[PDB]
Coordinates of C-alpha atoms and ligand atoms in Angstrom, one line a residue:
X1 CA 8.0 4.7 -0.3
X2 CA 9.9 6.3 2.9
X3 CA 9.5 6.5 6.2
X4 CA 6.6 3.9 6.4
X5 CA 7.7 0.3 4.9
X6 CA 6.2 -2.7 6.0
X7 CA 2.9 -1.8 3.5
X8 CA 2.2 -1.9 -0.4
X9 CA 0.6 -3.6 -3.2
X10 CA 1.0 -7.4 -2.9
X11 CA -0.3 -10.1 -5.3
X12 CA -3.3 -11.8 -4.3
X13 CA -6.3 -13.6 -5.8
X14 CA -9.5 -16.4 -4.4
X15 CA -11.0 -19.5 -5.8
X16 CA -14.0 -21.0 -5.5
X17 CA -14.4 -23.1 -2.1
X18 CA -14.4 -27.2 -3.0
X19 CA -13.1 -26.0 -6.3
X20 CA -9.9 -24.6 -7.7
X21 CA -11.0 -21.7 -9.8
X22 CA -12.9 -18.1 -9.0
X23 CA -15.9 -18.5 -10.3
X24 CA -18.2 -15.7 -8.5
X25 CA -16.5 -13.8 -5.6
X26 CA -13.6 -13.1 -8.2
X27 CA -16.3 -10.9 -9.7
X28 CA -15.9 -8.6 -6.9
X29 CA -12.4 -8.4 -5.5
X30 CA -9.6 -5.7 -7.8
X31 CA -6.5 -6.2 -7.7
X32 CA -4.0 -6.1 -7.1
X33 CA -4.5 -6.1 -2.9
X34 CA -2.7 -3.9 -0.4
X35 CA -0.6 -5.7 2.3
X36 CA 1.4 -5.0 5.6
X37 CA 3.7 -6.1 7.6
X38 CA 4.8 -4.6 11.4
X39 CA 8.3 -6.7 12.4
X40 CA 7.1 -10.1 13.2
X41 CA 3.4 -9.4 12.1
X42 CA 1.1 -8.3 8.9
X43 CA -2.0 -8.3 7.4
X44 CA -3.7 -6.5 4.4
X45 CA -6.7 -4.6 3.1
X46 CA -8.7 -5.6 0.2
X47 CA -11.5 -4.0 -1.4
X48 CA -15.1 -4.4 -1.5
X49 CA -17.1 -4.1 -5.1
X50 CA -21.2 -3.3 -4.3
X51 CA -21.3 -3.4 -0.7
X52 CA -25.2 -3.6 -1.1
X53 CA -23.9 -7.5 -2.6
X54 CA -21.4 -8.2 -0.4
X55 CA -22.6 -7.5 3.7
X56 CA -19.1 -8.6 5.1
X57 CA -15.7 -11.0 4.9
X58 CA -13.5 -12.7 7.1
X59 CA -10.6 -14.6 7.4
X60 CA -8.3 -17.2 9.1
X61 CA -12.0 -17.5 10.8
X62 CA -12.6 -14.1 12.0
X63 CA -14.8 -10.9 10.9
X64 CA -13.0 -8.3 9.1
X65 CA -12.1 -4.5 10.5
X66 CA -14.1 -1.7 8.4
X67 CA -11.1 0.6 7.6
X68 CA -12.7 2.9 4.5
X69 CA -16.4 2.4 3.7
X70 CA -17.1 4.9 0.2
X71 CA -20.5 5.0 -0.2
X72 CA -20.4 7.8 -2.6
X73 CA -18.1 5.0 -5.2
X74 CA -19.7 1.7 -3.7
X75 CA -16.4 0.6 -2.7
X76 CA -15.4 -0.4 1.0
X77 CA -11.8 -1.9 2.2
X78 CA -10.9 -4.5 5.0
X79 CA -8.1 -5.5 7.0
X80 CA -7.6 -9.0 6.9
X81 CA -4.5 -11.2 9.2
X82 CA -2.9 -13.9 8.0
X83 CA 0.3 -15.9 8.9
X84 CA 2.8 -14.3 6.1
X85 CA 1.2 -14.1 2.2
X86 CA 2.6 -16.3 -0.1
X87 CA -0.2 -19.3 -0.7
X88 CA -4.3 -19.6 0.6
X89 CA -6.1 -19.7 3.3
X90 CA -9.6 -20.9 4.0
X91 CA -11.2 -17.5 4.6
X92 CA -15.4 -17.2 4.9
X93 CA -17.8 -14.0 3.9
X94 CA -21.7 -13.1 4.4
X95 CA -24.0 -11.9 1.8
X96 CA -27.4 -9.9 2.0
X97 CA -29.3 -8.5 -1.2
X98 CA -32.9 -7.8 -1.4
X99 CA -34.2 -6.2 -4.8
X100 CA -35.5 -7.1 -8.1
X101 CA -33.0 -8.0 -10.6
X102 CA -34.5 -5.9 -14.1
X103 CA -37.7 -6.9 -13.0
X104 CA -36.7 -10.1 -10.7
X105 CA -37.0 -10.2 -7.2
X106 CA -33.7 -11.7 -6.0
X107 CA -33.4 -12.5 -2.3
X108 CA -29.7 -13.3 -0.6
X109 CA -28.6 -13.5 3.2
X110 CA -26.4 -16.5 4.1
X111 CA -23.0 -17.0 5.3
X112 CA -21.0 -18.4 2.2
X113 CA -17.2 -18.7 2.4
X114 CA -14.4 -18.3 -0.7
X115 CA -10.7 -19.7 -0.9
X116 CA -8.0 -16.7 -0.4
X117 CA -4.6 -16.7 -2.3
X118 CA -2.3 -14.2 -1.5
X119 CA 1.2 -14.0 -2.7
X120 CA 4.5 -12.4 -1.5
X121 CA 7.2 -12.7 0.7
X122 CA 8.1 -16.0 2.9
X123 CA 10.5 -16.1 5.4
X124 CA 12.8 -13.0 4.9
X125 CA 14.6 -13.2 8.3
X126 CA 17.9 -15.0 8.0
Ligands
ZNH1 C1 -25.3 -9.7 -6.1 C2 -25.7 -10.6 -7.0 C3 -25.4 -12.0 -6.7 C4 -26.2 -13.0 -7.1 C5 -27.5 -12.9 -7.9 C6 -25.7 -14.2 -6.6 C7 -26.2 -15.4 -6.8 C8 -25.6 -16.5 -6.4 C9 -26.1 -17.8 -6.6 C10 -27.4 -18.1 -7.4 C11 -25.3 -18.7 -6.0 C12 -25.5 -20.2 -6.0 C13 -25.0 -20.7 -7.3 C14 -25.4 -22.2 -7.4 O1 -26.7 -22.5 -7.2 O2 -24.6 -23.0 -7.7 C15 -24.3 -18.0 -5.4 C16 -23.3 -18.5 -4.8 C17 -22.3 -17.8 -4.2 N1 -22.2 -16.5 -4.2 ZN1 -23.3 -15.2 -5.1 N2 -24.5 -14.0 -5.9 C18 -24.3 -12.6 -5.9 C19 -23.3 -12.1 -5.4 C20 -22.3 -12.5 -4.7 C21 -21.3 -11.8 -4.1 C22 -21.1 -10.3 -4.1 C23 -20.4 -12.6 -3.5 C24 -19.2 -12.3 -2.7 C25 -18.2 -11.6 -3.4 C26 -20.9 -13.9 -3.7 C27 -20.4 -15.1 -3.3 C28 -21.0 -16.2 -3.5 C29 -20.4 -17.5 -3.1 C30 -19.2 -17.6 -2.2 C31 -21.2 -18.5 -3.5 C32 -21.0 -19.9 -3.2 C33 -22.2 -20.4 -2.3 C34 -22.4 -21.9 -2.6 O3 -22.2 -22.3 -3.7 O4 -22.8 -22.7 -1.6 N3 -22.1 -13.8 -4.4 N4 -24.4 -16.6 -5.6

C-alpha cells in the first residue's frame, strides 16, 4: 500500500443484540471488513450478503452510505463511522423479504438492530 494509507482490512465481527454471541446477522457479514482513517477521522465499509434479505444498516444511529451495490454477485458494501475501531458499538439494520421459502411464504420488513465489534488501532497519537 502507497500513496493512499489511512484504509485496509481491519478485524471486525457482530453479536446478537441482548446477547453476546452472532447468532443470525453473522450469517451475512465476510470478513474480514475494510476500514479507514483520514488524520483525526475514520470509518469502514462492510459488505452486504443477499441484499433481497438485508434492505439496509446503520450505525452509531445513523443510515449507511451505498458505496458499491453488485447486483450481478448479490453483494453490496457500506460505509459506516465510528469513534476509532477497537471494541462494539450499538449499531441497528432494516430488513424486507417477501417470497416463498421452497414452497413457504415468508414475509419480513421491520427494523431489527445487531451488536458491531470492530477491532484495530486505539489511540496512536503520542
Ligand atoms: C432472509 C431470511 C431470513 C429469515 C427467514 C429470518 C428470520 C428471522 C426470524 C424468524 C427471526 C426471529 C427469531 C425468533 O423468533 O427468535 C429473525 C430475527 C432476526 N433477524 Zn432474521 N431472518 C432472515 C434474515 C436476516 C438477515 C439477512 C438479517 C440481517 C443480516 C437478519 C437479522 C435478524 C435480526 C437482527 C434478528 C433479531 C430480531 C429479534 O430477535 O427481535 N435476519 N430473523
Amino acid at each position: 500500500s502507497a500513496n493512499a494509507a489511512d484504509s485496509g482490512t481491519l478485524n471486525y465481527e457482530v453479536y446478537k443484540y441482548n446477547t453476546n454471541d452472532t447468532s443470525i446477522a453473522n450469517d451475512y457479514f465476510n470478513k474480514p471488513a475494510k476500514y479507514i482513517k483520514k488524520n483525526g477521522k475514520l470509518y469502514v465499509q462492510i459488505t452486504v450478503n443477499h441484499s433481497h434479505w438485508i434492505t439496509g444498516m446503520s450505525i452509531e444511529g445513523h443510515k449507511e452510505n451505498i458505496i458499491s451495490k453488485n447486483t450481478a454477485k448479490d453483494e453490496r458494501t457500506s460505509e459506516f463511522e465510528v469513534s476509532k475501531l477497537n471494541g462494539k458499538i450499538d449499531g441497528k439494520i432494516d430488513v424486507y423479504i417477501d417470497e416463498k421459502v421452497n414452497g413457504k411464504p415468508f414475509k419480513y420488513d421491520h427494523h431489527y438492530n445487531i451488536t458491531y465489534k470492530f477491532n484495530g488501532p486505539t489511540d496512536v497519537a503520542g
